[PDB]
Design a binder for this molecule. Sequence first.
Ligand SMILES: *CC(=O)COP(=O)(O)O
Ligand SMILES: *CC(=O)COP(=O)(O)O
Lengths: 249, 249
Amino acid sequence: AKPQPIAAANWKCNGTTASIEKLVQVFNEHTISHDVQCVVAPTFVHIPLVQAKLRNPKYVISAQNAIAKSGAFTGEVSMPILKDIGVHWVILGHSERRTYYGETDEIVAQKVSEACKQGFMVIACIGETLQQREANQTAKVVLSQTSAIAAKLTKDAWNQVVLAYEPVWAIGTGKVATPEQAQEVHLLLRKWVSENIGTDVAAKLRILYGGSVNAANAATLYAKPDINGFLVGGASLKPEFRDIIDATR
Amino acid sequence: AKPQPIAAANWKCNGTTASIEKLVQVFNEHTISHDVQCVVAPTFVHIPLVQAKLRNPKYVISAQNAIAKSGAFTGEVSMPILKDIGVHWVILGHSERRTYYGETDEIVAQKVSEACKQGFMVIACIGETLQQREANQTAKVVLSQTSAIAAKLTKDAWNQVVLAYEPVWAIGTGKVATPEQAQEVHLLLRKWVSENIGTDVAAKLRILYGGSVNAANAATLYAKPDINGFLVGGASLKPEFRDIIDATR
Ligand SMILES: *CC(=O)COP(=O)(O)O
Ligand SMILES: *CC(=O)COP(=O)(O)O
């Protein structure tokens, strides 16, 4: 049987106090009656507002990024700082960060390791580019990204790890991976985890799909045996995030 | 006569809710009786706490960094987002950001321009490295950084601009620039602004010194004719920030 599903909202760099208050009320009023971990990741400056207004018992609050240690890092937010204000989830290795803000496989793996050490639940993002997929390098790429992370983790740290398979070509492009495309990658990821980390770890591991998930395509994606939920960008800013949660029933 | 001084606290990536509540109480209880703009720049996640607790009428709250536009920028905080939550000051071009997070002269100038367009007061950071100073390139460097910013600004936008001369070698090193060293650079900066932007702009422009400022060295720095206050790192996390404010009397 599948482990507990996750429906995660990456709001990215979006929102006003008014829009967030309205959307959070929508999320609060949506009564969820199955076992699912909902996650909302607002911008750093919006974290306290969401903490103050979000009351739905199925939800936790996540950061969109973090650095490992406090200190002389102007503009950045550290893991101890998040922990202190009551945020113990974090998204790491998200694609535009990897691509434009210099987060290499090594850097992402290090961040994931430090977050686990500091008691975070981590949504670690992996995924191939359009060119990588065309060159039939999808498996090589996601396994390389996963193994980099794994190399810095103890077996027991995996209880805190959630993988998000998010092909770069599906992010905000209106071109969702098909259920067959997504399942194929989830299956190979779980096999690798089973063989390299443990059969027990593999059985409990949530592997989420991300990239153009919406209310209409979510259920058929979730029907696949190795998809454990979603990392949602655009649609998570809208009332249809309710439908995506319910698609994990 | 000197324009209104500024005493600005860059807390960098530091603080807990408990430490911030204590330090803000210290700042609140310190009664300031001269004309000065105090500025506190906490981490993004701490902005609402500081907004809720800081009451000293001489203070405004600043962001430590921002990007210009909202959108698909995981982990980042935009200028419209800050404006909406009531933050209309921002520090830009701070040294570790220039050096490690890829913020070139062009990128910093663009950020400053967008912040001004969005109605921000901007503390724009400039300054030479140790090697640059040894090679007698200080003037060339700070003028190049300043001119890059100036090229993207209308004359009227300068009413929103505060320059912070912050030599890289003086940041957190316990090696403050001497009053003579700082004044020499402030004088040449103001001359450039006078000649290139306008005599009126130059007279009103706040040029702050940053780099190992503390309670003991602040007054003698402020005594120099072209120093208009301070951008303070380490000492701004301590009760002695009160003394630094009072050193602008
Ligand atoms: C995971 C992610 O970045 C999704 O973005 P979307 O707008 O394609 O859902
Ligand atoms: C401006 C700045 O980064 C100062 O740091 P400090 O700890 O040297 O004051």
